[PDB]
User: Which sequence fits this backbone?
């Protein structure tokens, strides 16, 4: 991510959003709402996979800063995995 | 009141946005940030799929096949202060 | 034969090739850059390729368009205005404390012109750049017969958007 | 972040020294960790 | 046309471009640096960027302001004073034993001026520097018609605080 | 104005800048080095620093003082004495077998002098060095109008103790 | 792979084809069809 107009909604907000998406929610009433939720991955416009689970995440802390203290650039490393083994006919549809 | 140490003063001219502070009931330590700091978090999901099956009651079978959530890890840091 | 030479001379004389003193440059913050400017070198983008080895042969494929730069060598008056302008422009890119500003504040536009006959101009290129730095200045004792000079070098921001800038830059 | 635990530390012994024998520069490598598994709503507050 | 040339000449005559012998330098402890000085070369900061590759295009983002350096080429008298001053200044940075002193002791200030008409001066830049080194001296046998010369090179301490120094340096 | 020029001429004429032929060198083992010597270049120590990156700025800190070297270009007579002296001095540093001697045996002292008016001298520097090597010698056939020459280059032992040597060297 | 005339047939279809060849078919009735299918490899024209 690199900021051009508003650093908070571009660089300093996306990191918090990812950090929230990776975590569970243990105060929910139902059992299924406590598990970390799953996301939909769409690489460009041509590869789309559903029910993707986020496993790892990382980012640096020596990025350039704005006069107000928000990042002007950052980089996040992610590892993602599927939730089931795919059949030969199903995996072709993903492309 | 804790005891101060490090580069806490402003005589050097660097913004407080470029410093770290560690505070407890006894000491307060201030330092800079070097070139190799990062923040990491991780979660555990469970490798081998399975066989002798596939399936065309039905819903429960698939739920077992789906990856399971096992546990997590609190965030960790690696900070080269200076 | 000489007939071919005569025909070539006839065709060559009619068409007027451009000479080397027809350039003109306008900068946003100098209002007088044309008089002070002496040299300028610029290239906008360059295609970069990758070589793929197949058996006993090679095939290339373009990948990128690398950014460019602009540098100029300006003369200066007594009680220098150009040096002060460059200093002020350089200062905005990064605050002395160690913080950086948003792109809209420090960017500027440079325009390169071509001179037609009878004092008419056309636009060659437009680029958005940030001041980068100035190389080095000497100020020797024996330079009795020479004027002051120093180079100013800029760098383009992004290849996606060369000329067009945000609303903040346009409206001030 | 509150309630962090320090689990490793290191520093150099070939740093410049003062005439009285004190360091003029050094560097410390630290490894830190939280003390609980954060919830989705709690971790956003840290930012 | 010639009318345009005449107008440009009229414009050019009125404005006086600065010549190369208008520099002036003062060093803290020399007291006579201006007479001995021959050349300088200073650049204060330079802005550094990172190139980020996105697909088939590139975008840059400034990161730093790197420090600079000052060098000068002084003539010397019989029974050298400038040379002894340089050795004394160098010796204070690091003690012969192998221990270093606090920054307040060895730092020094250099001012570079601009000479207006009728002998009036204005400040161009001010920097805090430490003596670093002097490269090489030759003292050849056959240099019958040349004066002695040697270069002195300094390095800027910190970009955060270029000119202002601690109270200890100011009050002695 | 011309009055400033007259004052500058008056002040400049009085002070006599040192010329390039006033050097003098004494070596421990030549007893005639002054006549044979032609060139010499020397630097004693140089401060080395480290750049530390903090955010968007840079701060330096001195760390070391690197050693120096001395090299000289001497003429030689028929039945060379200088070449034999350099060969003998070089041989002591390492025995032909492959063993090294203790430092006291092969070290030597070199002194650089400055020439005052009326044939008086002062000491510029004193260094303790070991012979290192000589670069290369040509001995061409057509050099009918040139004398023989070869360079001798030394290296300083330790920055802690530049001039003072052990008792064995002093008393022989 | 590198495209010269039609990118979909040359570069973007080959990857999907390979991803199809690697995976099994678990909705099949017989047992032999449930294991991923085996392939014939020919390196140039001389190793089969």
Assistant:
């Amino acid at each position: 991510f690199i900021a051009l107009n508003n650093p908070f909604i571009e660089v300093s907000g996306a990191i918090a959003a990812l950090t929230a998406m990776i975590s569970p929610e243990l105060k929910a009433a139902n059992v299924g709402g406590q598990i970390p939720e799953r996301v939909t991955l769409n690489i460009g416009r041509r590869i789309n996979i559903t029910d993707v689970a986020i496993q790892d995440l990382s980012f640096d802390l020596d990025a350039p800063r704005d006069s107000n203290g928000y990042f002007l650039k950052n980089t996040v490393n992610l590892q993602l995995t599927g939730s089931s083994i795919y059949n030969s006919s199903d995996i072709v549809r993903a492309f | 009141a804790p005891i101060a140490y490090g580069v806490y003063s402003q005589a050097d001219g660097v913004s407080p946005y470029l410093k770290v502070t560690l505070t407890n009931s006894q000491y307060q330590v201030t330092g800079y940030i070097s070139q190799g700091a990062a923040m990491n978090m991780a979660q555990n999901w469970e490798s081998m799929g399975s066989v002798s099956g596939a399936l065309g009651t039905t819903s429960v079978a698939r739920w077992n096949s789906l990856m399971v959530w096992e546990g997590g890890t609190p965030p960790t840091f690696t900070l080269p202060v200076t | 034969e000489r007939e071919v030479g005569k025909l070539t001379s006839i065709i060559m004389n009619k068409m007027l090739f451009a000479q080397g003193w027809q350039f003109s440059v306008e900068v946003d913050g100098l209002e007088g850059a044309d008089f002070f400017a002496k040299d300028i070198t610029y290239h906008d983008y360059s295609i970069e390729y990758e070589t793929i080895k197949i058996g006993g042969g090679n095939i290339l494929q373009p990948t990128e368009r690398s950014p460019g730069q602009i540098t100029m060598m300006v003369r200066d008056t007594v009680d220098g205005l150009v040096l002060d302008w460059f200093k002020t422009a350089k200062s905005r890119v990064i605050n002395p404390d160690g913080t950086g500003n948003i792109p809209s504040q420090y960017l500027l536009n440079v325009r390169i012109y071509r001179l037609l006959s009878s004092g008419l101009t056309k636009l060659e290129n437009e680029m958005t750049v940030f001041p980068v730095t100035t190389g080095d200045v000497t100020y020797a004792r024996d330079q009795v017969t020479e004027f002051k000079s120093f180079p100013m070098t800029f760098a383009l921001h992004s290849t996606f958007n060369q000329s067009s800038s945000s609303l903040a830059s346009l409206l001030g």
